[PDB]
Symmetry: C2
Subunit: 145 residues, 2 copies
Protein backbone atom coordinates (compact mmCIF):
# COMPACT_ATOMS: atom_id res chain seq x y z
CA UNK A 1 0.00 0.00 0.00
CA UNK A 2 3.04 2.21 0.81
CA UNK A 3 4.79 0.42 -2.08
CA UNK A 4 1.79 0.76 -4.37
CA UNK A 5 1.83 4.59 -3.93
CA UNK A 6 5.55 4.89 -4.56
CA UNK A 7 5.36 2.66 -7.71
CA UNK A 8 2.45 4.68 -9.12
CA UNK A 9 4.30 7.93 -8.42
CA UNK A 10 7.23 6.57 -10.40
CA UNK A 11 4.96 5.49 -13.27
CA UNK A 12 3.20 8.85 -13.46
CA UNK A 13 6.53 10.68 -13.36
CA UNK A 14 7.59 8.70 -16.51
CA UNK A 15 4.21 9.00 -18.22
CA UNK A 16 4.47 12.87 -17.95
CA UNK A 17 11.42 18.72 -17.44
CA UNK A 18 11.80 16.18 -14.59
CA UNK A 19 12.28 12.44 -14.08
CA UNK A 20 13.26 9.80 -11.53
CA UNK A 21 14.65 6.33 -11.09
CA UNK A 22 14.86 4.00 -8.22
CA UNK A 23 18.32 3.15 -6.96
CA UNK A 24 19.83 -0.28 -6.17
CA UNK A 25 16.44 -2.01 -6.33
CA UNK A 26 15.10 0.02 -3.29
CA UNK A 27 11.82 2.00 -3.99
CA UNK A 28 12.76 4.18 -0.91
CA UNK A 29 15.92 5.41 -2.61
CA UNK A 30 15.55 7.39 -5.83
CA UNK A 31 17.54 9.59 -8.13
CA UNK A 32 15.78 12.74 -9.43
CA UNK A 33 16.68 14.52 -12.71
CA UNK A 34 15.83 18.12 -13.45
CA UNK A 35 16.53 20.21 -16.50
CA UNK A 36 17.89 23.73 -15.94
CA UNK A 37 15.01 26.10 -16.81
CA UNK A 38 15.33 28.11 -20.07
CA UNK A 39 16.57 31.72 -19.61
CA UNK A 40 18.54 31.00 -16.44
CA UNK A 41 22.24 30.38 -15.99
CA UNK A 42 21.15 26.70 -15.56
CA UNK A 43 19.75 26.39 -19.07
CA UNK A 44 20.99 23.27 -20.85
CA UNK A 45 22.14 21.71 -17.55
CA UNK A 46 21.02 18.30 -16.30
CA UNK A 47 20.91 18.06 -12.50
CA UNK A 48 20.84 14.87 -10.52
CA UNK A 49 19.25 14.72 -7.08
CA UNK A 50 19.51 12.12 -4.37
CA UNK A 51 16.03 11.25 -2.87
CA UNK A 52 15.62 9.37 0.39
CA UNK A 53 12.03 8.42 0.98
CA UNK A 54 11.35 7.99 4.74
CA UNK A 55 9.46 4.89 6.10
CA UNK A 56 6.28 6.89 6.98
CA UNK A 57 6.11 8.65 3.62
CA UNK A 58 3.75 10.19 2.50
CA UNK A 59 3.01 11.71 5.94
CA UNK A 60 6.72 12.52 6.19
CA UNK A 61 8.39 14.34 3.28
CA UNK A 62 11.13 12.90 1.10
CA UNK A 63 14.67 14.24 1.73
CA UNK A 64 16.32 15.68 -1.40
CA UNK A 65 19.73 17.17 -2.15
CA UNK A 66 21.69 17.96 -5.32
CA UNK A 67 24.31 15.43 -6.33
CA UNK A 68 25.36 17.60 -9.36
CA UNK A 69 27.47 20.67 -8.27
CA UNK A 70 25.41 23.85 -8.73
CA UNK A 71 26.01 27.55 -7.96
CA UNK A 72 22.73 28.90 -6.48
CA UNK A 73 22.07 30.97 -3.28
CA UNK A 74 19.43 28.40 -2.14
CA UNK A 75 21.59 25.28 -2.61
CA UNK A 76 24.76 24.51 -0.74
CA UNK A 77 27.74 24.76 -3.23
CA UNK A 78 29.58 22.30 -1.06
CA UNK A 79 27.02 19.59 -0.09
CA UNK A 80 23.99 20.04 -2.40
CA UNK A 81 21.69 20.67 0.57
CA UNK A 82 18.50 22.62 0.01
CA UNK A 83 15.64 24.02 2.19
CA UNK A 84 12.38 23.98 0.37
CA UNK A 85 9.17 25.02 2.07
CA UNK A 86 7.33 22.21 0.23
CA UNK A 87 9.66 19.62 1.73
CA UNK A 88 9.13 21.26 5.17
CA UNK A 89 6.14 23.07 6.72
CA UNK A 90 4.30 23.14 3.29
CA UNK A 91 4.56 19.37 2.79
CA UNK A 92 1.29 17.35 2.64
CA UNK A 93 0.59 13.65 1.75
CA UNK A 94 -1.62 15.07 -1.04
CA UNK A 95 1.61 16.26 -2.79
CA UNK A 96 4.00 14.08 -4.72
CA UNK A 97 7.75 13.65 -5.28
CA UNK A 98 7.04 15.21 -8.74
CA UNK A 99 5.59 18.45 -7.34
CA UNK A 100 8.77 18.60 -5.14
CA UNK A 101 11.02 18.24 -8.25
CA UNK A 102 8.97 20.82 -10.14
CA UNK A 103 9.18 23.12 -7.18
CA UNK A 104 13.01 22.65 -7.09
CA UNK A 105 13.10 23.40 -10.79
CA UNK A 106 11.12 26.62 -10.16
CA UNK A 107 13.57 27.57 -7.41
CA UNK A 108 16.37 27.40 -10.09
CA UNK A 109 14.32 29.98 -12.06
CA UNK A 110 13.90 32.28 -9.04
CA UNK A 111 17.07 32.60 -6.91
CA UNK A 112 16.62 34.30 -3.51
CA UNK A 113 19.74 35.98 -2.01
CA UNK A 114 17.63 37.11 0.95
CA UNK A 115 17.21 33.66 2.51
CA UNK A 116 20.14 31.44 1.43
CA UNK A 117 21.68 27.97 2.01
CA UNK A 118 25.03 29.17 0.81
CA UNK A 119 26.42 32.36 2.45
CA UNK A 120 29.24 32.78 -0.09
CA UNK A 121 26.94 32.42 -3.10
CA UNK A 122 24.49 34.86 -1.58
CA UNK A 123 27.39 37.26 -0.77
CA UNK A 124 28.51 37.22 -4.43
CA UNK A 125 25.01 37.71 -5.73
CA UNK A 126 24.72 40.97 -3.75
CA UNK A 127 28.25 42.40 -4.39
CA UNK A 128 28.45 41.25 -8.00
CA UNK A 129 25.39 39.82 -9.59
CA UNK A 130 26.71 39.52 -13.16
CA UNK A 131 29.62 37.43 -11.74
CA UNK A 132 27.08 35.21 -9.89
CA UNK A 133 25.36 34.53 -13.21
CA UNK A 134 28.71 33.91 -14.97
CA UNK A 135 29.74 31.48 -12.24
CA UNK A 136 26.33 29.70 -12.39
CA UNK A 137 26.54 29.31 -16.15
CA UNK A 138 30.15 28.05 -16.02
CA UNK A 139 29.24 25.56 -13.22
CA UNK A 140 26.32 24.40 -15.44
CA UNK A 141 28.67 23.91 -18.47
CA UNK A 142 31.26 22.25 -16.32
CA UNK A 143 29.25 19.94 -14.02
CA UNK A 144 25.75 19.61 -15.40
CA UNK A 145 26.61 18.94 -19.07
Amino acid sequence: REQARLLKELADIQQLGVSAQIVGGDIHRWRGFIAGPLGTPYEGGHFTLDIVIPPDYPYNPPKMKFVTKIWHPNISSQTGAICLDILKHEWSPALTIRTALLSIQAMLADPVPTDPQDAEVAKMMIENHPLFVQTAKLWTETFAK
Copy 2:
Protein backbone atom coordinates in the same frame (compact mmCIF):
# COMPACT_ATOMS: atom_id res chain seq x y z
CA UNK B 1 -3.13 37.53 -2.12
CA UNK B 2 -5.58 38.82 -4.78
CA UNK B 3 -2.99 38.03 -7.44
CA UNK B 4 -2.87 34.38 -6.30
CA UNK B 5 -6.66 33.91 -6.51
CA UNK B 6 -6.88 35.76 -9.89
CA UNK B 7 -4.13 33.55 -11.27
CA UNK B 8 -5.74 30.34 -9.91
CA UNK B 9 -9.12 31.41 -11.33
CA UNK B 10 -7.62 32.06 -14.80
CA UNK B 11 -5.73 28.75 -14.83
CA UNK B 12 -8.88 26.87 -13.79
CA UNK B 13 -10.84 28.43 -16.68
CA UNK B 14 -8.05 27.92 -19.37
CA UNK B 15 -13.62 17.88 -15.72
CA UNK B 16 -13.75 20.75 -13.24
CA UNK B 17 -14.18 24.50 -13.31
CA UNK B 18 -15.10 27.56 -11.24
CA UNK B 19 -16.23 31.12 -11.50
CA UNK B 20 -16.62 34.07 -9.20
CA UNK B 21 -20.21 34.25 -7.81
CA UNK B 22 -20.82 38.05 -7.99
CA UNK B 23 -18.12 40.62 -7.34
CA UNK B 24 -16.35 38.92 -4.40
CA UNK B 25 -13.23 37.13 -5.56
CA UNK B 26 -13.23 35.16 -2.28
CA UNK B 27 -16.51 33.54 -3.28
CA UNK B 28 -16.65 31.11 -6.15
CA UNK B 29 -19.04 28.64 -7.62
CA UNK B 30 -17.29 25.35 -8.45
CA UNK B 31 -18.40 22.87 -11.10
CA UNK B 32 -17.65 19.19 -11.30
CA UNK B 33 -18.73 16.65 -13.93
CA UNK B 34 -19.90 13.32 -12.51
CA UNK B 35 -17.31 10.66 -13.44
CA UNK B 36 -17.95 8.03 -16.12
CA UNK B 37 -18.98 4.62 -15.03
CA UNK B 38 -20.42 5.95 -11.82
CA UNK B 39 -24.06 6.76 -10.76
CA UNK B 40 -23.06 10.48 -11.18
CA UNK B 41 -22.32 10.03 -14.87
CA UNK B 42 -23.96 12.77 -16.92
CA UNK B 43 -24.35 14.99 -13.84
CA UNK B 44 -23.14 18.53 -13.40
CA UNK B 45 -22.57 19.42 -9.77
CA UNK B 46 -22.27 22.91 -8.43
CA UNK B 47 -20.34 23.66 -5.29
CA UNK B 48 -20.14 26.66 -3.05
CA UNK B 49 -16.48 27.80 -2.43
CA UNK B 50 -15.62 30.25 0.38
CA UNK B 51 -11.95 31.32 0.25
CA UNK B 52 -10.97 32.61 3.72
CA UNK B 53 -9.06 35.95 4.39
CA UNK B 54 -5.74 34.16 4.98
CA UNK B 55 -5.77 31.83 1.95
CA UNK B 56 -3.45 30.02 0.92
CA UNK B 57 -2.55 29.15 4.53
CA UNK B 58 -6.16 28.49 5.41
CA UNK B 59 -8.00 26.07 3.01
CA UNK B 60 -11.07 26.94 1.02
CA UNK B 61 -14.43 25.88 2.47
CA UNK B 62 -16.48 23.85 -0.04
CA UNK B 63 -19.92 22.16 -0.02
CA UNK B 64 -22.21 20.77 -2.73
CA UNK B 65 -24.99 23.10 -3.80
CA UNK B 66 -26.49 20.38 -6.05
CA UNK B 67 -28.24 17.63 -4.05
CA UNK B 68 -26.35 14.35 -4.33
CA UNK B 69 -26.67 10.82 -2.93
CA UNK B 70 -23.12 9.79 -1.78
CA UNK B 71 -21.94 8.37 1.58
CA UNK B 72 -19.25 11.09 2.00
CA UNK B 73 -21.56 14.09 1.25
CA UNK B 74 -24.60 15.09 3.29
CA UNK B 75 -27.83 14.46 1.27
CA UNK B 76 -29.48 17.12 3.35
CA UNK B 77 -26.94 19.96 3.32
CA UNK B 78 -24.13 19.04 0.84
CA UNK B 79 -21.46 19.19 3.57
CA UNK B 80 -18.27 17.25 2.83
CA UNK B 81 -15.23 16.46 4.89
CA UNK B 82 -12.24 16.06 2.54
CA UNK B 83 -8.82 15.41 3.98
CA UNK B 84 -7.23 17.81 1.43
CA UNK B 85 -9.44 20.59 2.81
CA UNK B 86 -8.37 19.77 6.41
CA UNK B 87 -5.20 18.18 7.83
CA UNK B 88 -3.87 17.51 4.33
CA UNK B 89 -4.22 21.14 3.17
CA UNK B 90 -0.98 22.91 2.14
CA UNK B 91 -0.45 26.36 0.56
CA UNK B 92 1.28 24.43 -2.24
CA UNK B 93 -2.11 22.95 -3.25
CA UNK B 94 -4.67 24.86 -5.30
CA UNK B 95 -8.40 25.12 -5.45
CA UNK B 96 -8.30 23.08 -8.66
CA UNK B 97 -6.63 20.16 -6.89
CA UNK B 98 -9.31 20.22 -4.22
CA UNK B 99 -11.98 20.08 -6.99
CA UNK B 100 -10.10 17.19 -8.61
CA UNK B 101 -10.00 15.36 -5.25
CA UNK B 102 -13.76 15.82 -4.73
CA UNK B 103 -14.33 14.54 -8.22
CA UNK B 104 -12.16 11.49 -7.35
CA UNK B 105 -14.28 10.93 -4.26
CA UNK B 106 -17.34 10.70 -6.54
CA UNK B 107 -15.55 7.88 -8.48
CA UNK B 108 -14.73 6.14 -5.18
CA UNK B 109 -17.23 6.41 -2.25
CA UNK B 110 -16.15 5.20 1.19
CA UNK B 111 -19.22 3.98 3.15
CA UNK B 112 -16.98 2.88 6.05
CA UNK B 113 -16.11 6.41 7.05
CA UNK B 114 -19.26 8.33 6.03
CA UNK B 115 -20.60 11.85 6.15
CA UNK B 116 -24.21 10.59 5.57
CA UNK B 117 -25.09 7.58 7.83
CA UNK B 118 -28.38 6.98 6.02
CA UNK B 119 -26.57 6.92 2.63
CA UNK B 120 -23.68 4.67 3.92
CA UNK B 121 -26.23 2.22 5.49
CA UNK B 122 -27.96 1.91 2.14
CA UNK B 123 -24.66 1.53 0.26
CA UNK B 124 -23.58 -1.25 2.67
CA UNK B 125 -26.82 -3.19 3.18
CA UNK B 126 -28.52 -2.54 -0.09
CA UNK B 127 -25.95 -1.64 -2.66
CA UNK B 128 -28.20 -1.95 -5.76
CA UNK B 129 -30.74 0.41 -4.06
CA UNK B 130 -27.82 2.81 -3.41
CA UNK B 131 -26.76 2.84 -7.05
CA UNK B 132 -30.37 3.22 -8.18
CA UNK B 133 -30.97 6.15 -5.82
CA UNK B 134 -27.64 7.85 -6.60
CA UNK B 135 -28.53 7.75 -10.29
CA UNK B 136 -32.10 9.01 -9.69
CA UNK B 137 -30.64 12.01 -7.82
CA UNK B 138 -28.12 12.63 -10.58
CA UNK B 139 -31.07 12.65 -13.04
CA UNK B 140 -33.17 14.81 -10.76
CA UNK B 141 -30.79 17.44 -9.40
CA UNK B 142 -27.72 17.34 -11.59
CA UNK B 143 -29.16 17.14 -15.15
